[PDB]
C-alpha cells in the first residue's frame with residue numbers, strides 16, 4: 001500500500017516527550033473506592049458495568065465504569081488519553097481512578113451527565129438544534145485531534161446530551177489512540193455502521209479523518225431520519241452499503257490511489273453502483289431538517305478518500321454553521 005499522513009496536526013505527538021504518548025510506561029495511581037457509594041446500575045457494556053454513584057467526601061453524583069480487566073495495556077491507554085484530554089471542550093471528565101479494596105477490579109470515575117434519550121430527542125429536534133450539537137461535537141474532535149488523539153469510536157451512543165442545559169459530552173475513549181505519522185493501526189475499531197472505508201478495505205495507515213467519516217454518518221442519519229444511514233449486516237456488507245450511495249467507480253479510484261488489495265470476499269457482493277445524488281434521500285418526513293448547506297457539508301465528509309474529507313477545523317468554517 002501507498003503511505004499516507006494526516007493533513008492537520010501531523011507531528012503533534014512527534015514534538016512531544018515520550019511521556020505524553022507512551023501509555024505503557026504511564027504510572028497509574030488507583031485511589032480507594034470507599035469514597036464512593038454505588039447508587040444504581042445504569043447499564044452494561046462489552047467489558048464494563050456502569051453505575052450511578054455518590055462521592056461521600058463532597059455529596060456529588062458521579063458515574064463509575066467498573067472495567068472487566070481483559071487487557072491491561074488498553075486500560076492504561078484509555079486512562080492516559082482521558083488524563084491528557086481532561087478539561088477539554090465537551091470531553092467527558094475523568095474525576096478519579098479507583099480499585100475496590102476486596103475485588104481489586106479497576107474502575108473509572110467520571111463527572112455525572114444527565115442524558116436525554118435518543119428517541120425523546122429525534123422527533124422534536126429542529127434544524128438549528130442539529131447545527132448547534134454538530135458544532136459542539138466538532139469542538140471536541142478538533143480539540144482531541146489537536147492533542148494528537150483519534151477517538152476511533154464516534155457514534156450517537158458515545159455522545160451524551162443534556163438537552164435542558166444544552167450540554168454535550170463525547171464519551172468512551174476505550175478505542176482511542178495516539179496518532180503517529182506513518183504508523184499502521186488495527187482496523188478492528190469503531191462500530192460497524194460508522195466504520196470508514198479505510199477500515200473496511202484493511203488500509204492501516206489511517207488518521208483523524210476516520211472520526212470525520214463517522215461524524216458524516218451521524219449527520220446523514222439525523223437530517224434524513226434514517227438510523228443508521230449505512231446499514232451493513234457484517235463488515236463486508238458495510239462497504240457494499242456505502243458503495244450503493246457513493247458508487248463503485250470512486251471506490252476503485254480510492255483503492256488504486258493507495259494501491260489497496262481488495263479482499264476476495266468482495267468479489268461476489270460488491271457489484272456495480274452509480275454515484276447517488278444526496279437530494280434523493282429527502283422526503284416529507286425529513287425536508288424540514290435538510291438545506292443546500294447541510295447537503296454540501298455532508299458531501300464533504302462522506303468521501304472514500306480519507307485525505308479529501310474536511311478536517312474538524314475546516315468543518316467548523318462551513319456555511320452550515322453560520323447560524324450558530
Ligand SMILES: CC(=O)NCCCNCc1ccc(-c2ccccc2)c(Cl)c1
Nearest residue numbers: 115118121133134156157159160218222
Ligand atoms: C451513557 C449513555 O446513556 N449513553 C447513551 C447516549 C445516547 N446518545 C444520544 C444522542 C447522541 C447524539 C445525538 C446527535 C445529535 C446531533 C447530531 C447527531 C447526533 C442524538 Cl440526537 C442523540
